[PDB]
Amino acid sequence: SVVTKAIVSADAEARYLSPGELDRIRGFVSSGERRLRVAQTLTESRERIIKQAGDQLFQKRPDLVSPGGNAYGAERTASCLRDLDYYLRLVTFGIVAGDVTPIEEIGVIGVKEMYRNLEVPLPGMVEAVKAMKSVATGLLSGDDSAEVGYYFDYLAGALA
Amino acid sequence: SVVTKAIVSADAEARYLSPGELDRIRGFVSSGERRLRVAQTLTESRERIIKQAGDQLFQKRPDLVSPGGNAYGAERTASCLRDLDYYLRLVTFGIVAGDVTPIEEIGVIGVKEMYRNLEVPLPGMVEAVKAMKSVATGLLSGDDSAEVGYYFDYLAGALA
Amino acid sequence: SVVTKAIVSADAEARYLSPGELDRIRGFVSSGERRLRVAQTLTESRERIIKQAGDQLFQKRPDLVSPGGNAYGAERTASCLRDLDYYLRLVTFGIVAGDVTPIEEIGVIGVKEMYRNLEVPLPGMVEAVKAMKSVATGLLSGDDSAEVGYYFDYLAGALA
Amino acid sequence: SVVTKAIVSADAEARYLSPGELDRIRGFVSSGERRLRVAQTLTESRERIIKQAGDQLFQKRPDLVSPGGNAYGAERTASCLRDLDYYLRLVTFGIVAGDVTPIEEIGVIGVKEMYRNLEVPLPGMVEAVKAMKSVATGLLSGDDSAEVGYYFDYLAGALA
Amino acid sequence: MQDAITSVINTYDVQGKYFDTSAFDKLKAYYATGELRVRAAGTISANAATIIKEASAKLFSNQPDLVRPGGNAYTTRRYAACVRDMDYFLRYATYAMLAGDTSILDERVLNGLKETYNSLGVPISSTVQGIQAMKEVTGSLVGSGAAKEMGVYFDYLSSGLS
Amino acid sequence: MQDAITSVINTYDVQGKYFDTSAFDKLKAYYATGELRVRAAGTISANAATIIKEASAKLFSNQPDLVRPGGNAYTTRRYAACVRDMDYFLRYATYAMLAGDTSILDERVLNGLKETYNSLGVPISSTVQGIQAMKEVTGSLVGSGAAKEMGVYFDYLSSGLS
Amino acid sequence: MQDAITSVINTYDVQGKYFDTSAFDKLKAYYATGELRVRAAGTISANAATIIKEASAKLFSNQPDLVRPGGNAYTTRRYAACVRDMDYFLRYATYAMLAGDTSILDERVLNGLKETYNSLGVPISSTVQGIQAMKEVTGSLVGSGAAKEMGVYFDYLSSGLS
Amino acid sequence: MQDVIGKVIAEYDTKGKYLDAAALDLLRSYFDSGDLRLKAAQAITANAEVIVRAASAKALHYTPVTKPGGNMYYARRYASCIRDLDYFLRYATYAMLADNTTLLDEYVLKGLTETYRALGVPLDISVRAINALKEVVAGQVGPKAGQEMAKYFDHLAKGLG
Amino acid sequence: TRLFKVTALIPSYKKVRGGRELQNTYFTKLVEYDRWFAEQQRIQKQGGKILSVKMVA
Amino acid sequence: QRRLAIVQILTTNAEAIVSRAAGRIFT
Amino acid sequence: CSIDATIVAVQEMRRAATGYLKSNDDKELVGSYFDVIIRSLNADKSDTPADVVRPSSPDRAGLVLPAIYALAGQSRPAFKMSRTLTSAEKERVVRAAYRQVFERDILAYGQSISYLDSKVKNGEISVKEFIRLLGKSELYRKQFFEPFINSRVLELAFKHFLGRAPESRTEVQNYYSIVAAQGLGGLVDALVDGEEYGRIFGEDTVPFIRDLGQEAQPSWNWGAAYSLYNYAAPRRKVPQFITLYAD
Ligand SMILES: CCC1=C(C)/C(=C/C2=NC(=C\c3[nH]c(/C=C4\NC(=O)[C@H](C)[C@H]4CC)c(C)c3CCC(=O)O)/C(CCC(=O)O)=C2C)NC1=O
Ligand SMILES: CCC1=C(C)/C(=C/C2=NC(=C\c3[nH]c(/C=C4\NC(=O)[C@H](C)[C@H]4CC)c(C)c3CCC(=O)O)/C(CCC(=O)O)=C2C)NC1=O
Ligand SMILES: CCC1=C(C)/C(=C/C2=NC(=C\c3[nH]c(/C=C4\NC(=O)[C@H](C)[C@H]4CC)c(C)c3CCC(=O)O)/C(CCC(=O)O)=C2C)NC1=O
Ligand SMILES: CCC1=C(C)/C(=C/C2=NC(=C\c3[nH]c(/C=C4\NC(=O)[C@H](C)[C@H]4CC)c(C)c3CCC(=O)O)/C(CCC(=O)O)=C2C)NC1=O
Ligand SMILES: CCC1=C(C)/C(=C/C2=NC(=C\c3[nH]c(/C=C4\NC(=O)[C@H](C)[C@H]4CC)c(C)c3CCC(=O)O)/C(CCC(=O)O)=C2C)NC1=O
Ligand SMILES: CCC1=C(C)/C(=C/C2=NC(=C\c3[nH]c(/C=C4\NC(=O)[C@H](C)[C@H]4CC)c(C)c3CCC(=O)O)/C(CCC(=O)O)=C2C)NC1=O
Ligand SMILES: CCC1=C(C)/C(=C/C2=NC(=C\c3[nH]c(/C=C4\NC(=O)[C@H](C)[C@H]4CC)c(C)c3CCC(=O)O)/C(CCC(=O)O)=C2C)NC1=O
Ligand SMILES: CCC1=C(C)/C(=C/C2=NC(=C\c3[nH]c(/C=C4\NC(=O)[C@H](C)[C@H]4CC)c(C)c3CCC(=O)O)/C(CCC(=O)O)=C2C)NC1=O
Ligand SMILES: CCC1=C(C)/C(=C/C2=NC(=C\c3[nH]c(/C=C4\NC(=O)[C@H](C)[C@H]4CC)c(C)c3CCC(=O)O)/C(CCC(=O)O)=C2C)NC1=O
Secondary structure, eight states, X not given: OHHHHHHHHHHHTTSOOOHHHHHHHHHHHHTHHHHHHHHHHHHHTHHHHHHHHHHHHHHHOHHHHSTTOSSOSSHHHHHHHHHXXXXXXXXXXXXXXXXXXXXXXXXXXXXHHHHHHTTOOHHHHHHHHHHHHHHHHHHSOHHHHHXXXXXXXXXXXXXX | OHHHHHHHHHHHTTOOOXXXXXXXXXXXXXXXXXXXXXXXXXXXXXXXHHHHHHHHHHHHOTTTTSTTOTTXXXXXXXXXXXXXXXXXXHXXXXXXXXXSHHIIIIIITTHHHHHHHTTOOHHHHHHHHHHHXXXXXXXXXXXXXXXXXXXXXXXHHHHO | OHHHHHHHHHHHHTSSOOHHHHHHHHHHHHTHHHHHHHHHHHHHTHHHHHHHHHHHHHHHOHHHHSTTSTTOSHHHHHHHHHHHHHHHHHHHHHXXXXXXXXXXXXXXXXXXXXXXXXXXXXXXXXXXXXXXHHHHHHHSOHHHHHHHHHHHHHHHHHHO | OHHHHHHHHHHHTTSOOOHHHHHHHHHHHHTHHHHHHHHHHHHHTHHHHHHHHHHHHHHHOGXXXXXXXXXXXXXXXXXXXHHHHHHHHHHHHHHHHTSSHHHHHHHTTTHHHHHHHTTOOHHHHHHHHHXXXXXXHHHXXXXXXXXXXXXXXXXXXXXX | OOOHHHHHHHHHXXXXXXXXXXXXXXXXXXXXXXXXXXXXXHHHHHSHHHHHHHHHHHHHHHOGGGTSTTSTTOSHHHHHHHXXXXXXXXXXXXXXXXXXXXXXXIIIIITTHHHHHHHHTOOHHHXXXXXXXXXXXXXXXXOHHHHHHHXXXXXXXXXXXX | OOOHHHHHHHHHHHHTOOOOHHHXXXXXXXXXXXXXXXXXXHHHHHSHHHHHHHHHHHHHHHOGGGGSTTSTTOSHHXXXXXXXXXXXXXXXXXXXXXXXXXXXXXXXXXXXXXXXXXHHTOOHHHHHHHHHHHHHHHHHHHOHHHHHHHHHHHHHHHHHHO | OOOHHHHHHHHHHHHTOOOOHHHHHHHHHHHHTHHHHHHHHHHHHHSHHHHHHHHHHHHHHHOGGGTSTTSTTOSHHHHHHHHHHHHHHHHHHHHHHHHTOSHHHIIIIITTHHHHHHHHXXXXXXXXXXXXXXXXXXXXXXXXXXXXXXXXXXXXXXXXXX | OOOHHHHHHHHHHHHTOOOOHHHHHHHHHHHHTHHHHHHHHHHHHHTHHHHHHHHHHHHHTXXXXXXXXSTTOSHHHHHHHHHHHHHHHHHHHHHXXXXXXXXXXXXXXXXXXXXXXXXXXXXXXXXXXXXXXXXXXXXXXXXXXXXXXXXXXXXXXXXXX | OOEEEEEEEXXXXXXXXXXXXXXXXXXXEEEXXXXXXXXXXXXXXXXXXXXXXEEOO | OHHHHHHHHHHHTHHHHHXXXXXXXXX | OOHXXXXXXXXXXXXXXXXXXXXXXXXXXHHHHHHHHHHHHHHTTSSSOOOEEEOOOTTSOOEEEOHHHHOSXXXXXXXXXXXXXXXXXXXXXXXXXXXXXXXXXXXXXTOOOHXXXXXXXXXXXXXXXXXXXXXXXXXXXXXXXXTSOHHHHHHHHIIIIISSOOOOHHHHHHHHHHHHHHHHHHHHHHHHSSHHHHHHTTTTBOOOOOOBTTBOOOSTTHHHHXXXXXXXGGGOOSOSHHHHHHO
16 A cells, blocks of 8 residues: 555655655545545446456457457456456456555466466457446546556556 | 677686687588578578468467457558568578577567567567468478577567 | 586576587587597507607706706616606596596696696606607608697697 | 774774874884884894805705806806895895884785796705795894894795 | 874885984884874863864854754754764864874865765865864863864865865 | 678678678678688687786897886786786687677777876886787797688787787 | 755855745645646656657657668567666656756766767667657657656757757 | 555465455555554654654653663664664565555564574563553554554564564 | 585675675575685684584485 | 735734744744 | 853744734645744754765765755655565566666666566565566676676776666776676675665665765765766766776
């Protein structure tokens, strides 16, 4: 979370938390109710977001559903919906955490090799997470969408 | 090259080359004519190799030339064949040099970042390298095909 | 051995063997028969080689055989010839291994300090090993004597 | 010098000289007249010391001046005696400085490499400096004999 | 750095000569003054903080724009840095006086100091004034002959900065 | 660094061209001379200390001023530094001869060396004369063709110090 | 480094007087755009790789010679270095925008940039063109109001290069 | 090192489902208590030296450990003890803000007992000093924050004890 | 003779350090054979105590 | 903005505060 | 001056300033910004906080830095490996180590030594061991040993492994002897196994540049040192410290 990063930064310099880091934590805790409400708002529409993201992903990249693609076939769809579900869950975890770290450990550190092994193209991932970004930012309010979009396109950039 | 690696290794410990790496240089030199002949064969057949590798890649991976694919369009296909030409030339450089150092420096260091900026699927590059390896080893005899196959294998592994 | 340095070089880079190192294990196994025959021919002719080299060493330097030198004395001469016997065995080891690390880690590392402890003159070392090289290149075949002289020259340079 | 060592030791700790260092300087300046007398005696007797010590060195080790020896010949014998003159001057420098720093920085750093380049037997140099010790300490009184012998023994150990 | 003994040794070594009468006379002259140098060094180490206090007071009195806004001593941080520089100058001048040579000064203080202050914006002239103030303060505490000897090195520092 | 093969590869790569008959001829020339280069390198590595000994003896016999007091090579430390410089010149001449290109000479010896000797006070003319001495001593041991090849790189070092 | 706040504080501290009307006007202007600048910084921090992609595409489409053989961007290593430099420029422009001062640019980009590019042979005009393309892309991405605030520091970098 | 947020995210990651109502309730219980935690942290930050000084005084000053033959008897050793008390206070503040003791266990208690054994540091006197620091912190920060900080000080005490 | 597993505690005698330096004091590393003599000498000069050394390979 | 309003209030009344302290402690 | 009088004055100004604000948060903020003054003057009941002293060898000068000078916020954030951190800040420390040794993150080229990173993250080797094995690797020999003569190699290695410029003719002399004798591995071993590296960085801390504000700065190498603490330092191939100390 933000608190852990602030504590690590303070320990690096062997000093107490600075007032800048202190009111960073103050803004983090004062914004907790909104962030939790956003995390839930993502949660009820999980199936809706995931299915619309998959549809937009097929529309943007027919190659994945095209013959010879890595995602070609009906069996790949069961894994696709579930993986988009994982990444949405990680996005919600990052939203409640206040930073991108939980996403980082759980789904980003080693994703490059993980899809190198499965021969999964990175552009497919970035377009799929962009689809989730579009769907969620459509569902959420503008102020909340501004905050959540960072996590979404951070996942996009990390995937490529 | 072999001589370059041996000399820089000897330089890193401030010493003269030992008789072992002198045997290194002698063995590399005694094999010069075969390397030159293999480079002859690859250079003279570049035009056929590039076309055959492009056809094999595109039939094995139709999605790249399919609508929405990276190589879709005449210009983008031309760029793909140009990249294949680059890597074949780098393979010839590596054959004459006796090691992957020319391939390393010109086309391996920063290649993932280059293609990630270019939105190029690395699995596509690996498939193209494998196809061009098969085409090139088809022309060469077993002893020479075994040698060039490992240069192509190093290229494929570097792209993966 | 040569395969040892190949493996450690591959480990230091955390990947499989380079095409140069593949060629180098190839050349080592291809030259193994000649090399082991050379080590043999040195092995059966060790008693004559050591005696001829020791007599040549005594012939060259009147100072060592003179009183106050580390060659004066029957048992001291025996110790001299025993050091020559050890060094010839290490040269055979180094021929077999295809490199000088068996020579280096037995009889090169700390040689200066050991002969300062023994008070043995180091010019005596270089002259003695030159004597062994001269006597070895004589009876042995020319191509064999090439690598034998290379190893003896490395040993002399290590001493000098 | 002693003053230099105290000053740089204080400087390393970013402090003024401790009472121990000031007491050390007081002791060093208290012995200034004795050190000057000893140095002036050694300087007055430089020709006699060099002559007699060279005689002792050459009778003890005739091999240096025998044909095939390094000091063989009038010019090489002159160089031999010139080296002893150098080291006697360095010993006087160390006497006045109160420490072996001038000897160390003029005639001890790289001495082994220098005499290796000149084929000069280090045991011969050690015997020469021991002869100089004997000849010089013969001239001095009992109290000053030990003081001069300490610098001579340091120089012998440096050569040995 | 090098002291008087090392200076004479170097001068006679570059010429490849033993010590003559002049060399021994100079060495004896240095040895005669050793106890005075040690006593002066002890006296300076006694009152180093004091000397810094009076020197800084005199400097900032005669140079009041230093501590006013726009001056380079106008801060507690910059004031502490200035008095630490004063500490440097006193310590190294005492080292030079004890050694009997100005080599340590050139090696560890004067080399690169003008460019250091030019980068930092430190006024060289005001630093020279502070060094001089330190000189008058130190002379009274050390006495007449020790003041002559010790002010030689202060003058060397001032001339090097000048 | 860069060797002959790497030199041809780089020249053709900058142009973007495949190898043609001229490039293959240059590669074949290097492969032809490789065995001679290896023999010469082994001989030099066996006799490096010797070559340094005769070269230093020649230089300090023709210019004894260098090793008398006041000379640049006058001390054990400075004499050792001189012989170490000669050892490095010999080793890198051997490296260049093995590689067939003078790129390592530039990068690892000649870039900034003249400035370093100018600061240190090293007489570059005497260094070049010592390099020429090493050249003639090496040629006798290595033979005619190996001597011409080694002299190319020795002269490259000498002209680079110029 | 400095920001607008540090600049005003120092300007009125060296004078030794409180903030006047011009000071409060500067601070109010700096604070008014603060939320817009932070929003733009979040957009850039989130989408830096995208901006690099379109900027590099535009630069190498306008000047194809850079990525063809014989061009400074012709290798995988040199292409990666080019896009890395572009990421540097974007990040430091974001830092300067958030600070409101170009001190960080002078301190940590311009100090040694010309030496680097003239040593490496990097074409300065092409780098300026790449910076301009980055400006256009980031302005299209973050809106015109934040586009001007990005463009002022992008122009500062471009003028520093040329 | 993890906080309550990281802890609950780790648990729901291992179990593999989204954050439910109970996770939300724990997160709110951490968030609403945040303002008290930052007030306590600021109070300790401003007055850390005074807290450590009072604790060291009452727990150590006129006890035999300061007298010769004790572990605290030196300028270096006394300064080291005050420095360790500073460690305890700062890391207890960090743990309180993170609302988790894993930071105290890892950053502070990893190999500390072996170091104290080898150095000759008495563990019981350290426990007394940590306790006294606990009551001093409670007194300065009030009962509500003192109760929270007492948990982390007691974690330190049981770690050493 | 490949590796040594060394546990040692080097205390601080010259000053009092504000940073952590807990793992700097009490630590266990694997040290190469060619380096163990120098490392042991350094630990001893620092005043530290070498608690135990075992043979790894 | 709040902190700048605070600063404006304090700078408008700077002489008052300084003179008040000076009178409190001096003469 | 009278410290009690100053405390009374600052308290009186606190009361006066708090009076005008007429807002509880404003009052508490300004009261804190005056309580900092009272707290500091109270804390300085003993002497001023001890000045930081940088130790040196007999070849170079020992320097002191006022404690006031360091704590102005410019202190570098030390990267430390705790062997138990989450993988994110472990990778953060690894990236910092790469940035320090290679002057920039060479992962922008895709270049890394994976097994060394795994070892340093797992805890088999410390950060000091990781730095030493990273400096004698093949990568470091490529960027910072081949293009340079031994003197410039010495200077850049000082910058990369000690985070400072060479400060003495004796220092460049000794390390040139070490490099000329033993190569890159010997030079890196001499730099990292020295007492200064263990004192400043220790086993678990990544080296950092010790420039202005971090510690006391030498004056005799000022311009050369701050030329060296610049990303354009590798662009200069002529050595600059041996030349300077000879001049
Ligand atoms: C939270 C961290 C995490 C992630 C992200 C994760 C993804 C993941 N997806 C997998 C399978 C897969 N997932 C996909 C879907 C993708 N691949 C294609 O290239 C498309 C671009 C795209 C769908 C459009 C595919 C094609 C497979 C291979 C076979 C299958 O469908 O199961 C697998 C291998 C075994 C399995 O099915 O579970 C993993 C580990 N696992 C994790 O523990
Ligand atoms: C010698 C080292 C070197 C390499 C390797 C290199 C590759 C390279 N390929 C490029 C474009 C391209 N490269 C490809 C190739 C891809 N198409 C398919 O997906 C495949 C997976 C794959 C080929 C097998 C394509 C389609 C483009 C055009 C994309 C664009 O317009 O940006 C470009 C951008 C410049 C241009 O368009 O002319 C570069 C620099 N450049 C170099 O200097
Ligand atoms: C395989 C590794 C190995 C080596 C190399 C080796 C050399 C060696 N030779 C020894 C004896 C000796 N060796 C010599 C040989 C010298 N006499 C003449 O000067 C010659 C120039 C020269 C020999 C060519 C002499 C004189 C001694 C007698 C030393 C003594 O007993 O005091 C000894 C001391 C052992 C003893 O005295 O019992 C060693 C260690 N030992 C080893 O285990
Ligand atoms: C001030 C410090 C210093 C020292 C010590 C020094 C030693 C020194 N000794 C030399 C030659 C020599 N030195 C000696 C002395 C050795 N002969 C016997 O073996 C003895 C054991 C021993 C003397 C006791 C001899 C014989 C030579 C002549 C070598 C030759 O001509 O080949 C030379 C070469 C001079 C030349 O001809 O150009 C030097 C530089 N140089 C210095 O700057
Ligand atoms: C906000 C930041 C800041 C402050 C306030 C500050 C005060 C300060 N006042 C000074 C002078 C002085 N200051 C005073 C006393 C005054 N001092 C006050 O605290 C009292 C209200 C008052 C007396 C009751 C006196 C008498 C001097 C003359 C020098 C001396 O004390 O010897 C000096 C020494 C430099 C000089 O000689 O001019 C400082 C550093 N420094 C700073 O960086
Ligand atoms: C051992 C030899 C040596 C010297 C002499 C030396 C001088 C020196 N003075 C410095 C700062 C300073 N020095 C001064 C002193 C000046 N201000 C003016 O008012 C006065 C004329 C004068 C005081 C009498 C000041 C004010 C600073 C602070 C500059 C700043 O940070 O803005 C600094 C940079 C900070 C640091 O130490 O890390 C150095 C290096 N350094 C050395 O290693
Ligand atoms: C933020 C401070 C900073 C800057 C500014 C910076 C620039 C910089 N760019 C470099 C490489 C490079 N930079 C470029 C730049 C590209 N060439 C193309 O033609 C374009 C015109 C242009 C960009 C649009 C290239 C081609 C290289 C590789 C050149 C080579 O190594 O041969 C290098 C050499 C070190 C390395 O390769 O890692 C530096 C120092 N580094 C810094 O730490
Ligand atoms: C941030 C986590 C952390 C902790 C907890 C820690 C404890 C710690 N205390 C130490 C020394 C010490 N610690 C103490 C304090 C003890 N003696 C008193 O009586 C008390 C009973 C008790 C403390 C309450 C003393 C006296 C020493 C000096 C012992 C010696 O050097 O002989 C040392 C050795 C290093 C040094 O002296 O600077 C460590 C590592 N270090 C850390 O980095
Ligand atoms: C591999 C590239 C390279 C080279 C060659 C190199 C040479 C080099 N020679 C040096 C000193 C020296 N070099 C020499 C040798 C010269 N003076 C003699 O008269 C001869 C004429 C001549 C040699 C043939 C001497 C005498 C010194 C000592 C100078 C001194 O200490 O003042 C030094 C400074 C060592 C120190 O700190 O004292 C270097 C760096 N450095 C490099 O990075």
